[PDB]
Amino acid sequence: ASVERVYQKKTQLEHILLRPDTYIGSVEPLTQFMWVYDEDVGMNCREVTFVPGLYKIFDEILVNAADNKQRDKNMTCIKVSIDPESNIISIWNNGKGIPVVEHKVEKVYVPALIFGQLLTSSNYDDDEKKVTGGRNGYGAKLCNIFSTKFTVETACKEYKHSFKQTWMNNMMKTSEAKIKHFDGEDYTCITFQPDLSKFKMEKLDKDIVALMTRRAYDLAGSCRGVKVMFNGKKLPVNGFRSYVDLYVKDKLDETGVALKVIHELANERWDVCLTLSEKGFQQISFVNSIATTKGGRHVDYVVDQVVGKLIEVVKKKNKVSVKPFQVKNHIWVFINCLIENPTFDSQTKENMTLQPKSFGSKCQLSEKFFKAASNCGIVESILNWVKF
Amino acid sequence: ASVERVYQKKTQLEHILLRPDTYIGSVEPLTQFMWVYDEDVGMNCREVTFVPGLYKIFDEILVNAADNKQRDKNMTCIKVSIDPESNIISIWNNGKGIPVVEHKVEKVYVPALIFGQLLTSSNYDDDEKKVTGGRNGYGAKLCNIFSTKFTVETACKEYKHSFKQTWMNNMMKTSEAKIKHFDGEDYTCITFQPDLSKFKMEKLDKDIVALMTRRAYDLAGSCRGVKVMFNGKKLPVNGFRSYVDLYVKDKLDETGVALKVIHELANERWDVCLTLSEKGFQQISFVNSIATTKGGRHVDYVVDQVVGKLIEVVKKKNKVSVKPFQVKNHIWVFINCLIENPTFDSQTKENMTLQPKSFGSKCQLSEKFFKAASNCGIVESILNWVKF
Ligand SMILES: Nc1ncnc2c1ncn2[C@@H]1O[C@H](COP(=O)(O)OP(=O)(O)NP(=O)(O)O)[C@@H](O)[C@H]1O
Ligand SMILES: Nc1ncnc2c1ncn2[C@@H]1O[C@H](COP(=O)(O)OP(=O)(O)NP(=O)(O)O)[C@@H](O)[C@H]1O
Ligand SMILES: CCCc1cc(=O)oc2c(C(=O)N3CCCc4ccccc43)c(OCCO)ccc12
Ligand SMILES: CCCc1cc(=O)oc2c(C(=O)N3CCCc4ccccc43)c(OCCO)ccc12
Ligand SMILES: [Mg+2]
Ligand SMILES: [Mg+2]
């Protein structure tokens, strides 16, 4: 091999296709025990086989829709459609559209800039302490790159125009946008056909559909004031507590007693539910409507408070050593939070790494909550073990 | 705010400084209970306060040195030097240098291309099934960008020249490389002054030095056939088993009995040690001399085998239900492995996501190992709990 074959330089776009894992996660199948929303049983936990990168290109568009609630607090609705037979996914939102106007620096229409060029964002000025999920200026381009067809439609009454442009072949082909007069109610609709060959798949199968469907339920639970429709039907989730009910309302502990679920809305930015776990520590958490599936400092911040109080309660009855990991072993926690300018260690945003002092808010759980937590079976489980 | 202030485009280099977290990890301090190598006590586990991004720019250069063992199996030595007073870190290695020659496509000297331009690598051709840690073509440029001064020195007898070039001010300033006749023993030496202002630090303090020192011990344990010196003294670690001894040789279980440590070199590519944990699941693992501090599929692959066998052993004595998470709760596992073309979800490479079928090798632990594992106190801990 010559010097020129050994030492190589890649463009940004080449690098994304060669090294997808740091952008969208694995492009190979994964089997994981997790929660999905199935057609036959609804919410359930089971082994699911899916390609993480395909989940993530969908998630990028879904979180972008949720983010529009921050640009326009009047937004009320996100509509998700998935058709496996045609391989078409669409995500529609109301509230303000994207300005249909030429960017005076980049000399392209704003929607074409921010959906068709890498490293483009409205989230790069951190002096604005935003609680959007978007931070990096990649997500929508990543979906475009991993799609055989990707269509952006947006309508903005302030600029009196609508915009429609389609990209094809992994963002490598496009044509002139259609610009039309518009004076109605604003919306944005992203419609894409994922490039299943990039994921070694033949079709959107039941497992990936059940995971994408569950993310729509997550959003109905996490994004305050936004209703969610899936395949033309409103999702019957109206807030985080009703979302948590999908997991715990019909569940018993191993002794046959219904799980006792405690809840506190500490403030507008923090919603916490807690119950007993009998299968080790479990967390379900969202930051700015992102599913933080590896947790992060927001989970540790809430859990450490509970662990500290419950160690106190146990000690007032343990006349040996109860270590924090033993208490955490019995916690199932659910968190929905809004964090200013969050940081994560990857574009996939599974682990939120911002320190609590920078969150922009606190979640000081009340003494009422801690009293209730001392009665949900965790303390009992610990004390029974202080006999062994 | 105008359209042009709201919607912004960044260059790759601007994006790295604005969004460092996905490239090097957090640039804010973190406190974590972990292992470091201190001047007073050696290897120990304690709360450590450090900035992850500073750890990682050092790690990128250290792993690049280890990677040279794959380009030249005759390499024998890596030398690490850290001087807090002068703020100078150097990492030196022998074995083949970098070709001191003009790249015929990029029209620059090879060392200047691969240390001074983003997305440059000898690891972009995956038809070569390499067990280097390098994959993405960023690491050395990230260290350069986060340094106030960054010097590359390399000497390559095949090309009969040595090369020395210095960058300054976060890779924004450089000058003509010094090229000289060379006919001696090849080496590469990277010397840098980290830009502590990027990490809100005044000096390389004892905690970061203790972590960087420990990574040198890790390398002495993980990189087969390479001796490591730190600040002019050889590290007395000669393989993975002697490295593991730094953690377990002087440790007792809670009942006062020395930890029983089991070991198997399954093949050249897999070294595994196992003992009892009394503080929940613990793993120490390396992939291609990277510390996989969030684990990954290589950890799960080994642990699942042990868990499966130990559940069998317990059952042959449990005439209730013992779940895998309960067995894993008592495992402390140490893994050193070589994986072909590994994938990770972040440039920081904390979590290795490649599926076992793609590893390029297997680690089928022997029946002798599983018998020994049934005697290291894990089974006993589980059975004692089958009474409660
Ligand atoms: N549904 C939408 N409605 C309005 N604006 C949108 C919508 N989707 C995307 N945008 C805009 O398009 C920009 C680019 O989106 P995207 O590529 O996902 O980057 P991002 O969301 O800012 N950051 P990230 O997702 O972390 O890579 C965003 O910053 C928004 O300004
Ligand atoms: N000590 C060294 N000796 C020889 N070659 C080196 C050394 N350090 C770096 N290189 C070369 O420089 C290239 C660039 O290094 P780097 O920027 O770290 O990228 P990488 O190691 O290939 N991938 P990554 O570390 O995952 O971003 C490597 O691919 C090697 O070819
Ligand atoms: C590579 C993508 C991994 C992933 C995506 C996802 O979408 O979900 C997950 C859940 C999960 O099912 N959920 C439910 C609601 C969203 C969520 C947030 C945080 C943690 C878990 C979850 C999960 O669960 C394990 C058992 O708990 C584990 C992993 C995931
Ligand atoms: C953001 C950087 C985090 C990190 C770096 C590091 O360097 O180490 C760590 C260790 C650790 O101390 N070690 C020892 C040897 C290297 C290693 C590999 C895998 C897991 C752990 C470790 C650790 O430990 C927790 C208690 O176990 C936890 C975290 C780290
Ligand atoms: Mg986005
Ligand atoms: Mg490297």
Curated annotation (Swiss-Prot), chains A, B:
Tissue expression from the record: Expressed in the tonsil, spleen, lymph node, thymus, skin, pancreas, testis, colon, kidney, liver, brain and lung. Also found in breast, colon and lung carcinomas, Hodgkin's disease, large-cell non-Hodgkin's lymphoma, lymphocytic lymphomas and seminomas.
Post-translational modification comment from the UniProt entry: (Microbial infection) Deubiquitinated by Epstein-Barr virus BPLF1; leading to stabilized SUMOylated TOP2A trapped in cleavage complexes, which halts the DNA damage response to TOP2A-induced double-strand DNA breaks. SUMOylated.
Lineage: Eukaryota, Metazoa, Chordata, Craniata, Vertebrata
Residues involved in ATP binding: 64, 93, 121-123, 134-141, 347-349
Superkingdom: Eukaryota
Record's protein name: DNA topoisomerase 2-beta
Cross-link (Glycyl lysine isopeptide (Lys-Gly) (interchain with G-Cter in SUMO2)): 129-130, 180, 251, 319, 323, 387
Additional note from the record: Eukaryotic topoisomerase I and II can relax both negative and positive supercoils, whereas prokaryotic enzymes relax only negative supercoils.
Location of the protein in the cell: Nucleus, Nucleolus; Nucleus, Nucleoplasm; Nucleus
Record function comment: Key decatenating enzyme that alters DNA topology by binding to two double-stranded DNA molecules, generating a double-stranded break in one of the strands, passing the intact strand through the broken strand, and religating the broken strand. Plays a role in B-cell differentiation.
Family, similarity comment: Belongs to the type II topoisomerase family.
Coiled-coil intervals, chain numbering: none
Subunit and interaction comment: Homodimer. Interacts with KIAA1210. Interacts with PLSCR1.
Disease: Defects in TOP2B may be involved in global developmental delay with autism spectrum disorder (ASD).
Interaction with DNA: region residues: 315-317
